[PDB]
Amino acid sequence: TKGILGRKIGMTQVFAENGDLIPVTVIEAAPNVVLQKKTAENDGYEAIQLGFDDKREKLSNKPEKGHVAKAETAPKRFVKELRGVEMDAYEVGQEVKVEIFSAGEIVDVTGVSKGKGFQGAIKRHGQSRGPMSHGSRYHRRPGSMGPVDPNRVFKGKLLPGRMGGEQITVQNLEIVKVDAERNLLLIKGNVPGAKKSLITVKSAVKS
Amino acid sequence: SYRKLGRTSAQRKAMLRDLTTDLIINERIETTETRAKELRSVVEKMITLGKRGDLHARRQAAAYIRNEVANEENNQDALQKLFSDIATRYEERQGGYTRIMKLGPRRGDGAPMAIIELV
Amino acid sequence: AVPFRRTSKMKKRLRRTHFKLNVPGMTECPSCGEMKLSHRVCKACGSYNGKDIN
Amino acid sequence: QKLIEDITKEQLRTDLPAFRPGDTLRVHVKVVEGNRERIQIFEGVVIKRRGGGISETFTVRKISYGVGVERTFPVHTPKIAKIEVVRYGKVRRAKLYYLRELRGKAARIKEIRR
Amino acid sequence: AAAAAAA
Amino acid sequence: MIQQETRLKVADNSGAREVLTIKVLGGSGRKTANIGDVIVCTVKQATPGGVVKKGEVVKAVIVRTKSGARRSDGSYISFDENACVIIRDDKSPRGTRIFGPVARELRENNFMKIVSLAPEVI
RNA sequence: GCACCUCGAUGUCGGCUCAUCGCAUCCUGGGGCUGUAGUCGGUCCCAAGGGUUGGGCUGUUCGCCCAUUAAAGCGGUACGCGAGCUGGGUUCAGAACGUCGUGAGACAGUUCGGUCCCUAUCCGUCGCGGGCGCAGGAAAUUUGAGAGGAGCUGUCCUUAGUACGAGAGGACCGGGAUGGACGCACCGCUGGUGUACCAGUUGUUCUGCCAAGGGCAUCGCUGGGUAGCUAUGUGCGGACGGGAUAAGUGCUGAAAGCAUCUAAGCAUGAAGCCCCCCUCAAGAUGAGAUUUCCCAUUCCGCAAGGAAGUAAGAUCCCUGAAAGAUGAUCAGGUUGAUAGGUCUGAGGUGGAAGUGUGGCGACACAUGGAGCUGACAGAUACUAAUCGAUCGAGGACUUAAC
RNA sequence: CUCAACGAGAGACUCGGUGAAAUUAUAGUACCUGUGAAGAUGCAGGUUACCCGCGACAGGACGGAAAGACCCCGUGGAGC
RNA sequence: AAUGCCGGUAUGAGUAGCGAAAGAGGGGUGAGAAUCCCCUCCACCGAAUGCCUAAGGUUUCCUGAGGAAGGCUCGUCCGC
């Protein structure tokens, strides 16, 4: 498999080869430098480390500076592993760019979703709402916790809490256009997360 | 997003106009820190309105400056003070006409106080 | 909404573990001291980096 | 949003005439019926102009056989072949939601000639 | 009856 | 966005004037239908001269809504009224004449005769 | 039926909200026998994975009817759930009708109306933190013991009007599209909202007056609307598949020279199971693994060990949001764009004030896509993120090679 | 409501000041299946669970509040 | 061991509440100021939230000091 990880900028619309109008998500995801190659005889599994969005030396630690010394590159903000890529096909310090994806391919997009704060059960779990009239004092409440006989609430009872901030994967999106000059990926559909957050684009599980 | 400061929007506008004008006459006031943070952008916007010096900017500033006397035994209003002293004082400076310096907490309610001054 | 049993002394003291409050961010004032909490004007001398501004 | 502008600058439709949200014009729409593509004319007054660069959309309203038809196009689509402004109207606002209930002379007395 | 009407 | 108990005017020469929706025929299922869907409906108001009488439970297909129907090219269409055409349980209309404009989305389905009998297809 | 528990109180029907469990299975999946020609069927097996509706009547469960659907399944959980909700009916105090009673009054006969309290201590559940451990202190990246989520299906076209059938009728299997419900994300569109955005307008008061504005009248009202949040909007998912299987179908075969699905050995076989799809996961005290930094000070305690300063690193304090009740997380702290201001833009609103022209005037036109602009961008240290302080290791013992 | 989504204010959240009440055998106070005065946080067998908090929900503690109002008994009473 | 009587002290717990509805700034006093005094804006009532006059209260009215307790916080202030 193949993949690359970067920052998304925002959404736009692009018409392509017909009159049809396509919702397009823009992702800056290049260049990515291979930092570490995981091997089965040493680490127990096969993976590669990709680094993205290098930063100033003031914001990087001495272990972070020493970890990227082997790849001959600046310390980078985002490090994630890809598993399992076609071993080996990449050497340590080789730049991964957006040219690996053609503009007709099917990819998997994952990322940390937008935070919503501590929210009620109606918004967090999609639970239906109580009546506002005919004497009713009941609305926006989670419901009965369960029966009487267990003398307890069963685990998994849906209750208000914090929504968002979790990893969400959207499957089988399509690349609309690839921009090798400006390091941009144009992806059909919606992408989870807020603006300028980390987005990982990996090849889909075919077929 | 702007702060609400525990007030109604009309009360917010009235209190911000009062604090802006009172800073414009007395040149140094002592409020809470969040009131200072909400006040400084409005005050530098009104100083920017005073920078232009034309009649339309003065009529824009007249909708915000309250009618209190600025300079005694001169009959100078605050609206005249913006276009006579503050604009000529801050002609070279591009923004940052106010600074906020924090003080200790208040005795009665633990409110963190701040010094606001025109610089 | 009614307590079934009273709280014992040990459970009350265990709940009051985090009720304590911390030492403020107090530092040496370069003018006189002592001492001055960080990012505020000193109440003794009225100075802040480093002019007497009161 | 300057990167979105640099992305979509190549696909902007710059040959279209400038039109205000209160005038009448005809839209040459290319429709695919199979196999021949006729170009039907949609004459009517512009109601909306909601901006956004490549996301700009405009709404044209006409009265056809006693039933009003509102049709919204994106500005830079290739489905529109040609836009001709019939006459310029004099309006007081950018959104003309009032005239979709004012049949029939009450819309004519508001859409006067400019 | 068992009517819950405690006051 | 045609719902149960939505009153639509009837846009053909069948005789009915106003009709009330009973059920959307799609699935178990939905409570909303937009354009090209067939709905079971009952006649509330009708002309004295016509084959369709008051109170008959008939089937009709929606031809006009004020909800904006979306097309693949990013375009939108919407009307100022909700209209429908009564059919004989297949896709042939009762009336010999059709009044008012007709949306193009009936052509995507096999609704050829209602489109051909329409005075204007948008 | 009995009266074992509760009368120093165990709130009782029907609905709303939230569910969970068992199949004696309503559909979907796989089969046997059919008086199964094919479609549709009947009966009996294996199968709880998922789904099992919108109304009219009645307080009603139930039931009848209308329109669908793949089907509108039975039950248990104090006839689940009132310190989660409603009191329509039962079930108080008023008043009637019919009947009984001389009467006061009575009626699982009817009707009208009729006070539903609780600030959560503990266990449970849903989220978020602070400690300590993981034999040195740290910064990252991670394997997965385990756990949770998802699991549904309709219609159309081919094969094929083929097999079958006198005809009417009409496939199994295998492909390709398009839907319904549900779920996850996100608004680029379509809309909603948007109380520090723009414009119009009414009454009164104020800035001495005209003009121009401010206050209040629900944001005074009305018409729009940036960001954010949103669905009714958009994109995507339940795909293709492996292993052992249930009911069945069997192969080779003897007990029992035959026969035989089985007692040994091999298969095939379901929306069940365990994975492949997604997510949390080493407090998994069984505390795992890889990469890279910091080093082995001083003073006591003869041994164990204990204090002070520090390196790598982190925190107090401050600017803030892509985060957020508070903690926490993330971007940053003067070799720098973290926030505000300033400038230039995007978008919104719609043609500001003043001046001039035409008119008796209300008003219109030109200057002029003007003026104004809250959270949206890009530049710019002008202002605030000052000086500072605190925490943070000298690495136990055996065994095989070094 | 289908079917709910935003916006404003007060409480709820944080900090400063002040500061109760109902209740309370002691309490280091998990779950399943049974047993038992026949419906278990404390019993038996097993399965899980580092220590201490903060914000929420209300299934249980046959929760609290009133020596049940219904039913029965008293050789009790009162009104008709 | 009486849902006993009286007194003291806990639990809940630094928890609920702090009782409709506009405040802001500059000076002054003072050991101590968000709450007291003065000034300038802003706001509210205005067939009253204005004036007085019964019933009623009875010193609560004025001045100068004071702040223990009472102002549901503070207090240099008060109907103390």
mmCIF file of N, CA and C in Angstrom, chain A residues 102-149:
data_model
loop_
_atom_site.group_PDB
_atom_site.id
_atom_site.type_symbol
_atom_site.label_atom_id
_atom_site.label_comp_id
_atom_site.label_asym_id
_atom_site.label_seq_id
_atom_site.Cartn_x
_atom_site.Cartn_y
_atom_site.Cartn_z
ATOM 1 N N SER A 102 -2.322 9.265 -8.360
ATOM 2 C CA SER A 102 -2.914 9.764 -9.591
ATOM 3 C C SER A 102 -4.306 10.316 -9.310
ATOM 4 N N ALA A 103 -4.799 11.149 -10.226
ATOM 5 C CA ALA A 103 -6.085 11.801 -10.007
ATOM 6 C C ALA A 103 -7.250 10.978 -10.543
ATOM 7 N N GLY A 104 -7.282 9.691 -10.209
ATOM 8 C CA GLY A 104 -8.445 8.858 -10.440
ATOM 9 C C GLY A 104 -8.570 7.783 -9.382
ATOM 10 N N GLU A 105 -7.721 7.857 -8.361
ATOM 11 C CA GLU A 105 -7.562 6.750 -7.434
ATOM 12 C C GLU A 105 -8.553 6.847 -6.277
ATOM 13 N N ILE A 106 -8.665 5.744 -5.542
ATOM 14 C CA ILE A 106 -9.565 5.629 -4.402
ATOM 15 C C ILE A 106 -8.723 5.495 -3.141
ATOM 16 N N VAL A 107 -8.926 6.406 -2.188
ATOM 17 C CA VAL A 107 -8.068 6.516 -1.015
ATOM 18 C C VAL A 107 -8.900 6.515 0.260
ATOM 19 N N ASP A 108 -8.225 6.258 1.377
ATOM 20 C CA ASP A 108 -8.806 6.347 2.710
ATOM 21 C C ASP A 108 -8.296 7.615 3.380
ATOM 22 N N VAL A 109 -9.208 8.394 3.954
ATOM 23 C CA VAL A 109 -8.872 9.643 4.628
ATOM 24 C C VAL A 109 -9.261 9.520 6.093
ATOM 25 N N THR A 110 -8.306 9.784 6.984
ATOM 26 C CA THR A 110 -8.529 9.708 8.420
ATOM 27 C C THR A 110 -8.005 10.970 9.091
ATOM 28 N N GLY A 111 -8.536 11.260 10.274
ATOM 29 C CA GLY A 111 -8.121 12.432 11.018
ATOM 30 C C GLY A 111 -8.918 12.570 12.294
ATOM 31 N N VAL A 112 -8.491 13.519 13.120
ATOM 32 C CA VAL A 112 -9.161 13.803 14.387
ATOM 33 C C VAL A 112 -10.307 14.770 14.120
ATOM 34 N N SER A 113 -11.519 14.380 14.515
ATOM 35 C CA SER A 113 -12.705 15.167 14.200
ATOM 36 C C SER A 113 -12.787 16.418 15.068
ATOM 37 N N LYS A 114 -13.686 17.323 14.678
ATOM 38 C CA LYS A 114 -13.851 18.595 15.369
ATOM 39 C C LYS A 114 -14.468 18.398 16.747
ATOM 40 N N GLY A 115 -13.964 19.154 17.721
ATOM 41 C CA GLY A 115 -14.475 19.064 19.077
ATOM 42 C C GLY A 115 -15.765 19.845 19.228
ATOM 43 N N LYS A 116 -16.708 19.278 19.981
ATOM 44 C CA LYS A 116 -17.992 19.914 20.227
ATOM 45 C C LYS A 116 -18.221 20.275 21.686
ATOM 46 N N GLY A 117 -17.323 19.887 22.586
ATOM 47 C CA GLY A 117 -17.520 20.139 23.995
ATOM 48 C C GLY A 117 -18.453 19.127 24.630
ATOM 49 N N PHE A 118 -18.818 19.412 25.876
ATOM 50 C CA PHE A 118 -19.705 18.527 26.618
ATOM 51 C C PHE A 118 -21.127 18.771 26.123
ATOM 52 N N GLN A 119 -21.716 17.768 25.477
ATOM 53 C CA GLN A 119 -22.996 17.941 24.809
ATOM 54 C C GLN A 119 -24.008 16.946 25.356
ATOM 55 N N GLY A 120 -25.289 17.279 25.189
ATOM 56 C CA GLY A 120 -26.368 16.447 25.674
ATOM 57 C C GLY A 120 -26.600 15.222 24.818
ATOM 58 N N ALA A 121 -27.486 14.354 25.316
ATOM 59 C CA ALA A 121 -27.706 13.054 24.687
ATOM 60 C C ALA A 121 -28.407 13.186 23.339
ATOM 61 N N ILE A 122 -29.205 14.246 23.166
ATOM 62 C CA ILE A 122 -29.925 14.475 21.913
ATOM 63 C C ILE A 122 -28.951 14.743 20.772
ATOM 64 N N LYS A 123 -27.907 15.525 21.033
ATOM 65 C CA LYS A 123 -26.935 15.827 19.988
ATOM 66 C C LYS A 123 -25.860 14.747 19.892
ATOM 67 N N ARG A 124 -25.432 14.204 21.034
ATOM 68 C CA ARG A 124 -24.334 13.242 21.047
ATOM 69 C C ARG A 124 -24.752 11.872 20.532
ATOM 70 N N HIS A 125 -25.978 11.437 20.814
ATOM 71 C CA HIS A 125 -26.401 10.097 20.459
ATOM 72 C C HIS A 125 -27.573 10.064 19.491
ATOM 73 N N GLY A 126 -28.083 11.219 19.068
ATOM 74 C CA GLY A 126 -29.206 11.250 18.153
ATOM 75 C C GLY A 126 -30.519 10.815 18.754
ATOM 76 N N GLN A 127 -30.648 10.871 20.076
ATOM 77 C CA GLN A 127 -31.855 10.401 20.739
ATOM 78 C C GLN A 127 -33.016 11.359 20.497
ATOM 79 N N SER A 128 -34.220 10.799 20.457
ATOM 80 C CA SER A 128 -35.400 11.580 20.125
ATOM 81 C C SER A 128 -35.857 12.409 21.318
ATOM 82 N N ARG A 129 -36.555 13.496 21.020
ATOM 83 C CA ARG A 129 -36.854 14.558 21.968
ATOM 84 C C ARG A 129 -38.276 14.454 22.513
ATOM 85 N N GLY A 130 -38.420 14.786 23.797
ATOM 86 C CA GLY A 130 -39.703 14.739 24.466
ATOM 87 C C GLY A 130 -40.614 15.867 24.033
ATOM 88 N N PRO A 131 -41.901 15.726 24.358
ATOM 89 C CA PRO A 131 -42.883 16.737 23.942
ATOM 90 C C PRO A 131 -42.726 18.047 24.701
ATOM 91 N N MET A 132 -42.991 19.153 23.999
ATOM 92 C CA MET A 132 -42.903 20.487 24.583
ATOM 93 C C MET A 132 -44.209 20.968 25.192
ATOM 94 N N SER A 133 -45.314 20.269 24.953
ATOM 95 C CA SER A 133 -46.616 20.712 25.431
ATOM 96 C C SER A 133 -47.448 19.536 25.919
ATOM 97 N N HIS A 134 -48.762 19.763 26.055
ATOM 98 C CA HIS A 134 -49.721 18.821 26.651
ATOM 99 C C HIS A 134 -49.314 18.442 28.072
ATOM 100 N N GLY A 135 -48.838 19.437 28.817
ATOM 101 C CA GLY A 135 -48.484 19.267 30.205
ATOM 102 C C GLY A 135 -47.098 18.730 30.457
ATOM 103 N N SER A 136 -46.347 18.396 29.410
ATOM 104 C CA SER A 136 -45.103 17.655 29.564
ATOM 105 C C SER A 136 -43.992 18.526 30.131
ATOM 106 N N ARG A 137 -43.298 17.993 31.134
ATOM 107 C CA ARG A 137 -42.085 18.594 31.663
ATOM 108 C C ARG A 137 -40.828 17.916 31.141
ATOM 109 N N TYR A 138 -40.948 17.077 30.116
ATOM 110 C CA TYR A 138 -39.861 16.218 29.670
ATOM 111 C C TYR A 138 -39.460 16.565 28.244
ATOM 112 N N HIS A 139 -38.197 16.944 28.074
ATOM 113 C CA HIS A 139 -37.517 17.114 26.799
ATOM 114 C C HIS A 139 -36.026 17.164 27.086
ATOM 115 N N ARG A 140 -35.220 16.927 26.047
ATOM 116 C CA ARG A 140 -33.759 17.025 26.049
ATOM 117 C C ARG A 140 -33.073 16.162 27.104
ATOM 118 N N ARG A 141 -33.700 15.086 27.552
ATOM 119 C CA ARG A 141 -33.184 14.230 28.605
ATOM 120 C C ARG A 141 -32.874 12.843 28.052
ATOM 121 N N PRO A 142 -31.899 12.124 28.634
ATOM 122 C CA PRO A 142 -31.435 10.884 27.983
ATOM 123 C C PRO A 142 -32.420 9.727 28.031
ATOM 124 N N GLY A 143 -33.168 9.567 29.109
ATOM 125 C CA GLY A 143 -34.150 8.504 29.191
ATOM 126 C C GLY A 143 -33.997 7.689 30.456
ATOM 127 N N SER A 144 -34.779 6.616 30.524
ATOM 128 C CA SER A 144 -34.680 5.678 31.632
ATOM 129 C C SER A 144 -33.374 4.900 31.552
ATOM 130 N N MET A 145 -32.734 4.705 32.707
ATOM 131 C CA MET A 145 -31.454 4.010 32.743
ATOM 132 C C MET A 145 -31.585 2.507 32.545
ATOM 133 N N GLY A 146 -32.786 1.956 32.680
ATOM 134 C CA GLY A 146 -32.999 0.549 32.451
ATOM 135 C C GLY A 146 -34.038 -0.043 33.378
ATOM 136 N N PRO A 147 -34.018 -1.366 33.528
ATOM 137 C CA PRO A 147 -35.009 -2.034 34.379
ATOM 138 C C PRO A 147 -34.674 -1.902 35.858
ATOM 139 N N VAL A 148 -35.519 -2.534 36.674
ATOM 140 C CA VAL A 148 -35.353 -2.498 38.123
ATOM 141 C C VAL A 148 -34.541 -3.693 38.609
ATOM 142 N N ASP A 149 -34.777 -4.864 38.012
ATOM 143 C CA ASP A 149 -34.253 -6.146 38.494
ATOM 144 C C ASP A 149 -32.726 -6.262 38.596
#
